[PDB]
Amino acid sequence: HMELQDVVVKGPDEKLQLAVFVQNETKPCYSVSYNGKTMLEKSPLGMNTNIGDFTKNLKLTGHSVDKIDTVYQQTRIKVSNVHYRANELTCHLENEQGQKLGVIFRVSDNDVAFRYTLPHQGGKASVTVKEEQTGFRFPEQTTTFLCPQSDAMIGWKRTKPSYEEEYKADAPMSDRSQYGHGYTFPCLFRIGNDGWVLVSETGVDSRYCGSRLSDVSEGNLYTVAFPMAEENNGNGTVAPAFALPGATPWRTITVGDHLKPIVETTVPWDVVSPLYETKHDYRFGRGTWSWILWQDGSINYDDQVRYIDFASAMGYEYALIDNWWDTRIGHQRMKSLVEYARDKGVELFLWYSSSGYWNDIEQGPVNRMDNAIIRKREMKWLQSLGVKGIKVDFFGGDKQETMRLYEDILSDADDHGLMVIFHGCTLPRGWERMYPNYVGSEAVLASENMVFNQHFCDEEAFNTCLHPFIRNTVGSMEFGGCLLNKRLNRNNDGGTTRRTTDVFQLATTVLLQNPVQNFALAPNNLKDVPAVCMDFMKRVPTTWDETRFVDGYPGKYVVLARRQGDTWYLAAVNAGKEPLKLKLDLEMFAGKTVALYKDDKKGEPELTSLKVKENGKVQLEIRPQGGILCIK
Numbered sequence: 001h002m003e004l005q006d007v008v009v010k011g012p013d014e015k016l017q018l019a020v021f022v023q024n025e026t027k028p029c030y031s032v033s034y035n036g037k038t039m040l041e042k043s044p045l046g047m048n049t050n051i052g053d054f055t056k057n058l059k060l061t062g063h064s065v066d067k068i069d070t071v072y073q074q075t076r077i078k079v080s081n082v083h084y085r086a087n088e089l090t091c092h093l094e095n096e097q098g099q100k101l102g103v104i105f106r107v108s109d110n111d112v113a114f115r116y117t118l119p120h121q122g123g124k125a126s127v128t129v130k131e132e133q134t135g136f137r138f139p140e141q142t143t144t145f146l147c148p149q150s151d152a153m154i155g156w157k158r159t160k161p162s163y164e165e166e167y168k169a170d171a172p173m174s175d176r177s178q179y180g181h182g183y184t185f186p187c188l189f190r191i192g193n194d195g196w197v198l199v200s201e202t203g204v205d206s207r208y209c210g211s212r213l214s215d216v217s218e219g220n221l222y223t224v225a226f227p228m229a230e231e232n233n234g235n236g237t238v239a240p241a242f243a244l245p246g247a248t249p250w251r252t253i254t255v256g257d258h259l260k261p262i263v264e265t266t267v268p269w270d271v272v273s274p275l276y277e278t279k280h281d282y283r284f285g286r287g288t289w290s291w292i293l294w295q296d297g298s299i300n301y302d303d304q305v306r307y308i309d310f311a312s313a314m315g316y317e318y319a320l321i322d323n324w325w326d327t328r329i330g331h332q333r334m335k336s337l338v339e340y341a342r343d344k345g346v347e348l349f350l351w352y353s354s355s356g357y358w359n360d361i362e363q364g365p366v367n368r369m370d371n372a373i374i375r376k377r378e379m380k381w382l383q384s385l386g387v388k389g390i391k392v393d394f395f396g397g398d399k400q401e402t403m404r405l406y407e408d409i410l411s412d413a414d415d416h417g418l419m420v421i422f423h424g425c426t427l428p429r430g431w432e433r434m435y436p437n438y439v440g441s442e443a444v445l446a447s448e449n450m451v452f453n454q455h456f457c458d459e460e461a462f463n464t465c466l467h468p469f470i471r472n473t474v475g476s477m478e479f480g481g482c483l484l485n486k487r488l489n490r491n492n493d494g495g496t497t498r499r500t501t502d503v504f505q506l507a508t509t510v511l512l513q514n515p516v517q518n519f520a521l522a523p524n525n526l527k528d529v530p531a532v533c534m535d536f537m538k539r540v541p542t543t544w545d546e547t548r549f550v551d552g553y554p555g556k557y558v559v560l561a562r563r564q565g566d567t568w569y570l571a572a573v574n575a576g577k578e579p580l581k582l583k584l585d586l587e588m589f590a591g592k593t594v595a596l597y598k599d600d601k602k603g604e605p606e607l608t609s610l611k612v613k614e615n616g617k618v619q620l621e622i623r624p625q626g627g628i629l630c631i632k
C-alpha cells in the first residue's frame with residue numbers, strides 16, 4: 001500500500017533489507033527487515049553538532065550505491081579468513097540551513113554497519129558532536145538480553161564503569177536499567193519468533209568516544225548515548241571532537257531468523273582496517289596465572305618461580321605476574337625471574353595499572369602507563385628484559401580522553417614489541433584488526449568473581465551460555481576460565497565452591513575465545529585433577545581458523561565447533577536444570593572416530609571414543625552444569 005521509503009538497500013542474498021526515510025519526515029529514520037519480517041521498526045538517525053543540527057527535517061539530496069567484494073585475513077578472532085560481500089548505500093543529507101551530512105550503510109547477508117560522514121564546510125575544519133539521535137526501535141513483542149551500565153566512580157577504589165555487570169535473559173523491553181544509565185554494548189534482542197538482533201559498534205579509536213545504549217523510551221526505542229560526565233573522575237569532556245572531513249564510528253546490527261549469524265558475525269572487523277603495521281611476529285598461546293587462585297599472597301619471587309615451573313611442565317608459553325609485583329618483588333629481581341623463565345622456555349606478561357589520576361588504585365605498579373615519557377621509559381626496560389606482554393588495568397571510562405590513552409598505550413607497546421591485554425576496561429571495538437599487538441580485553445564479569453563470590457559460581461553456567469552469543473561474539477574476551485580446582489582457594493579446601501563439572505570447564509576453553517589465555521589452573525592440579533583433564537589442557541589451542549554454530553539458546557545451553565588447521569573441536573554445555581538431549585548433525589566428523597570427553601553418570605570426567613556414521617548423526621545427553629567435548 002502506501003510506502004514512504006526514500007530508498008532501499010539489500011544484502012547480497014536479499015533476505016536482509018534496510019529502508020531509509022528522510023524526505024518529508026520530521027525525524028530522519030531507517031527500518032530493517034529480514035525475510036519479510038520487521039526486525040527493526042522506524043529508528044531515528046542524525047546528530048546534534050556545534051557546526052549545525054542534523055536532527056530534524058533533513059533532505060535527501062542524492063544517493064549512490066556500490067558493491068563490496070574483498071578478502072581479508074585476521075588473526076585473534078573466531079575465524080582466520082573472511083570473504084566480505086556487501087552492498088553499500090551512500091546517502092547525502094542536508095538540513096534547512098543547507099549544511100551537509102553523509103550516511104553510509106554497508107549491508108552483508110546478516111549485518112548492517114552504518115556511519116555518518118561530515119565534510120569540510122562553513123569554513124570549519126573541526127567539529128564537536130554534542131549528541132547522537134541515532135536509535136534502534138524494536139517490534140512490540142521484543143525481549144532483551146542486556147547488562148546495565150553502572151554509576152560512575154563506584155565499585156573497587158572508584159574504578160567503575162568497568163563493563164562488569166550482570167545480564168537478564170528474555171527481559172521485557174519496559175524494564176528499567178539497574179542504575180538508570182542504560183546498557184553497554186553489545187546488546188541482544190529476541191524479535192518474538194522472527195529471530196534475533198545484536199546491536200553494537202566498531203571502529204572506535206582516539207577520534208571518538210565509546211558509546212552505549214540509553215534506557216528505553218517510547219516503549220521500544222534505544223538511543224545511542226555518550227559517556228557520563230562523572231566518568232574519569234570528572235576529567236575530560238563528554239562530547240567527541242574531530243577533524244573535518246571526518247566520521248562517526250560504525251553502528252552495527254547483526255540480524256537473522258536464527259542464532260547462527262549472531263554467533264558467526266564478523267562485522268566488528270568487516271568495516272575497519274589496521275591503523276599501523278607491525279615489525280613483530282607476536283606469538284600467542286597459554287599462560288599460568290598465580291593470582292586468580294592464590295591471590296595477593298602469591299605475588300612473591302618463590303611462588304612466581306612455582307608458576308613459571310608449572311608453565312614449563314604444562315608446556316605453556318607464558319606466565320602472568322599480577323598486581324603488587326613492583327613493590328613486593330621489584331624491578332631488579334624481575335630480571336632474574338625473566339632469565340629463570342627463559343631457561344625453562346617460558347616468557348612473561350607483567351601487570352600494570354593504567355591509572356595515574358582518576359581513581360584510588362594503590363596496587364602497583366601505578367603511574368607507569370599514563371605519561372608517555374614514563375611509559376616509553378618503562379617499555380624500553382621491558383623490551384631490554386625481553387618481557388613479551390603487559391596486562392593493563394583500571395581505566396577511566398568511555399570518554400575520548402580514555403580512548404586516547406588506550407590507543408597510545410597500544411602504539412608505544414608495539415614500538416617495543418609488546419602484546420597488550422586490557423582489564424578493568426571497556427568493550428573492544430574491532431580492536432584486533434585495528435591494532436596488530438592487541439591480544440584481548442576483560443570487559444566482562446571474569447572468573448575472578450567466582451573466586452570472590454559464591455553467587456557467580458552458581459551463575460557460571462548461565463553466563464557461559466550467554467557469552468558466545470553476546471560479549472565474546474564481537475571480540476576477544478580474557479575470561480581466565482577453566483577452574484579445575486573444586487574449592488577456589490590456594491589449598492583447594494576452602495573459599496567458594498565450583499558448581500560445574502571438569503568437562504564443563506574443558507569445554508569452556510573452546511567456548512570462550514581469546515588469543516592469549518591465562519587459564520585458572522594451579523600446580524596442585526597436576527596431582528588432584530584426573531589426568532585426562534590436564535592432558536587435554538596440555539593440547540588446548542587459543543587461536544582458530546573457523547567457528548561454526550551448531551545449536552543453543554542464550555543462557556540455557558550452547559553448542560559450537562571451532563577448527564584449528566585440520567582439527568575440529570566441538571564443545572557444548574548445559575545451564576538448564578533438566579538433562580539436555582541433543583540430536584546433532586555434525587558434518588565435521590563425517591564417518592570418523594572422535595575423541596569424546598563426557599561427564600560420567602557420577603559427574604566425573606571420562607575420555608572415550610565415538611564413531612560418527614556417514615550421516616553425521618550424533619546423539620548426546622548433557623547433565624545440568626555439565627558439558628561435552630568432541631575432538632578430531
Ligand SMILES: [Ca+2]
Nearest residue numbers: 423424442446
Ligand atoms: Ca577486573
